[PDB]
Amino acid sequence: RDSEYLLQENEPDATLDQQLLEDLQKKKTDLRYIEMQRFREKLPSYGMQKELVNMIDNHQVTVISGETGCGKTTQVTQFILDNYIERGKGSACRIVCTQPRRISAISVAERVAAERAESCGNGNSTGYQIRLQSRLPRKQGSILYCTTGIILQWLQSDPHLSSVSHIVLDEIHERNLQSDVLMTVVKDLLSYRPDLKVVLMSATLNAEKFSEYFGNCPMIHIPGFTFPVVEYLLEDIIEKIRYVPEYYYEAIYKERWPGYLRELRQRYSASTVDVVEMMDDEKVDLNLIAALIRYIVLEEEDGAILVFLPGWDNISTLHDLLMSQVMFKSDKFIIIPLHSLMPTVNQTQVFKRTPPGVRKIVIATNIAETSITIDDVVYVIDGGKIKETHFDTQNNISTMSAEWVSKANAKQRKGRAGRVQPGHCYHLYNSLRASLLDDYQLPEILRTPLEELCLQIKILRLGGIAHFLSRLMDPPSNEAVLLSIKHLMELNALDKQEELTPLGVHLARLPVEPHIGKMILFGALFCCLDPVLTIAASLSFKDPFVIPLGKEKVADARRKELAKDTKSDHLTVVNAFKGWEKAKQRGFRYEKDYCWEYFLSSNTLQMLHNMKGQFAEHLLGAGFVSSRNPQDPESNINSDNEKIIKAVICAGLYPKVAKIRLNLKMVKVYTKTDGVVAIHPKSVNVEQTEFNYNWLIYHLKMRTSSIYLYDCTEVSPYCLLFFGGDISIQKDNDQETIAVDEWIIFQSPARIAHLVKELRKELDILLQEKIESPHPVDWKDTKSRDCAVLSAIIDLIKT
Ligand SMILES: Nc1ncnc2c1ncn2[C@@H]1O[C@H](COP(=O)(O)OP(=O)(O)O)[C@@H](O)[C@H]1O
Ligand code: BEF
Ligand SMILES: [Mg+2]
């Protein structure tokens, strides 16, 4: 699949070595190649070419540091390949370089291929590989850029990466979950691959930490800058444009704040100091960014503008803020949003050159803060904040919030300029803020739920989790890992012996959290993909409903209207999403009337539509669907059955179950984990007193003191029975009852418990046979074993 380049055999031969050597000499007479080499010789890395190659040749692991844009990503790979070609051994090269994101892997590969007077892929020297998309280069003497997630998937097919001669772990400052796992796997692989060469590269790095981690491996610094970059703090921004607005470290900030303002009045005008005093540290001043953008386009020379915002809500707000002005309405400006949830085609448009009289303005998240080179970028506006997930060990609650940027992220955002020409960087934090920023972000493995971490360790068969944790550079706490083990058992991704179930194997192959992975997996298995992908897309990210001030009464009445009789916050999103798609088919003006009428965000809805395509791609690579279309008729035979959908929701939401108590009109809700809870007023089941079932499933909790259920749907006890935990038959002599996880009790014939035990087992056999060669369930086949098992589960859910 995505392992076509890996499963080749590194077979060097002298005949190809001679062809590559002759091809290099013919390139040296090609005008397009010669002009590219003229630019390459100007890079700081070109002076270090002999030193870098000689050091990588004499040591197995090498740490390379250098200023942003000095040439690490695009030149080091070429230095290794061209050195082998000139030595008559070019075919022995199989260089793989990792990039943290798909936009980095694609654009860098296109750039390197262009620097070598070649097209990307097509059996040339350079190509790329990402999820379900690749331009593969030739077999021998080639360079392949790819995402770190591709290498992790490669380890499932070849844990030794046998055909790879050089692996380059690039942008290692992005200490994400997958990068830390891959780095620890490579370290263990060194002794088993004495012929392998490993290179570690970043611009903002505690290099000594990485060298010591890799057995005191040698370090090499690439000195020099490509182009200067002017840096501006908040005081410098307000002074230049004359802008007037129309936990313990904060105690240090408040303590030094009055003296800082006094020292600031001696270096800046009193008006700007007053503006600095009333600036808000809670959120990014989008009015200030827009005023700075206006100053750049009206007073400064030509050059694209790149803006860094924490999330999607900030990007769309600033975009509407600029588009509401006459100046940015015209075609002299092209405003391009950039979000990770966008299709890859939309992300690449940022690299397209603009007409000479047209100014490009890119509004991006941290997706654009590393690696990528945008040609015309001269001005970088750093909002100073970045979305970060945070996890508390005491209570199972994870929060996404806009946090102050670290010094490393700021240097990477500043690094997006000064690559092809001089630049300017404006940081929206004051000097006192700068002195209190951390050097680096906390590694994601130290501040997020670790269910994906544990699934990743188990799928690679790296031995016990305890041993692998001790080998990580920054190991998480054992209490956080045990909580993940408990959650994975309740999801039935791990059995009682902490071993992967068949379901857990497929969840480990899905690059999302297992709760979402389990929901989208059974949506494909039960042929209700489109409504389930919509629900999953809204559980991640956010729901499309908005509530203006004073409009709470009318907005609630709209939501209860869209819910019909489903008693389901998640089926309400489906109906709101479907009604939105039907309004788009009507027209653009009537689509806006629909969103305003029901208080729906067209921006959020469009983002949910993009997430649905990304979820379908994950299931496509996993082999559970046959196309990238979330509305493919193959996977939507049961998409208009409310009961099957609600079961798939329950499949993903368990064990987040709530029990309803009615008193003859009072309704009380209990969740076992936190006891009594209430229903959040935004939900559709707030004033509900008539329930067909006494059980709810939820996804989001809020406290807010007394626990509130953000989104909940009523669910049948037979959905909790099948997708639940342990099943026990309780005998009261007077009568028998069935229990799920002891507390979920309901009157039911005891033989149903035996049926569920047998149907769960057949589901495991179905998923087991899907492991070796995944194939979507052919629901057209009435007399098939896979459909018979799934039909029996469906009949149990319906009755
Ligand atoms: N798409 C491109 N168009 C023009 N120049 C580019 C492009 N990509 C890279 N470059 C030039 O090549 C240099 C090397 O970039 P890169 O190797 O990514 O630097 P680093 O790895 O040190 O961040 C950049 O400074 C830039 O000037
Ligand atoms: F160091 Be480069 F900007 F990736
Ligand atoms: Mg780089």
From Swiss-Prot:
Motif interval(s): DEAH box: 170-173
What is one process in the GO biological process aspect for this record? regulation of mRNA stability
- Where the protein is mainly located, per its record? nucleus
Say which domain of life the source belongs to: Eukaryota
Q: Report the cofactors.
A: Mg(2+)
Place the motif Nuclear localization signal on the sequence.
331-342
Q: Where is this region: Necessary for interaction with single-stranded DNA at the 3'-end of the G4-DNA structure?
A: 101-153, 312-371, 452-511, 663-670, 680-710
Domain Helicase ATP-binding span(s) in chain numbering? 53-223
Q: Which GO terms describe its cellular component?
A: axon; chromosome, telomeric region; cytoplasm; cytoplasmic stress granule; cytosol; dendrite; mitochondrion; nuclear speck
Instruction: Indicate the quaternary assembly.
Output: Found in a multi-helicase-TICAM1 complex at least composed of DHX36, DDX1, DDX21 and TICAM1; this complex exists in resting cells with or without dsRNA poly(I:C) ligand stimulation. Interacts (via C-terminus) with TICAM1 (via TIR domain). Interacts (via C-terminus) with DDX21; this interaction serves as bridges to TICAM1. Interacts with TERT; this interaction is dependent on the ability of DHX36 to bind to the G-quadruplex RNA (G4-RNA) structure present in the telomerase RNA template component (TERC).
Name of the protein:
ATP-dependent DNA/RNA helicase DHX36
What species was this sequence derived from?
Bos taurus (Bovine)
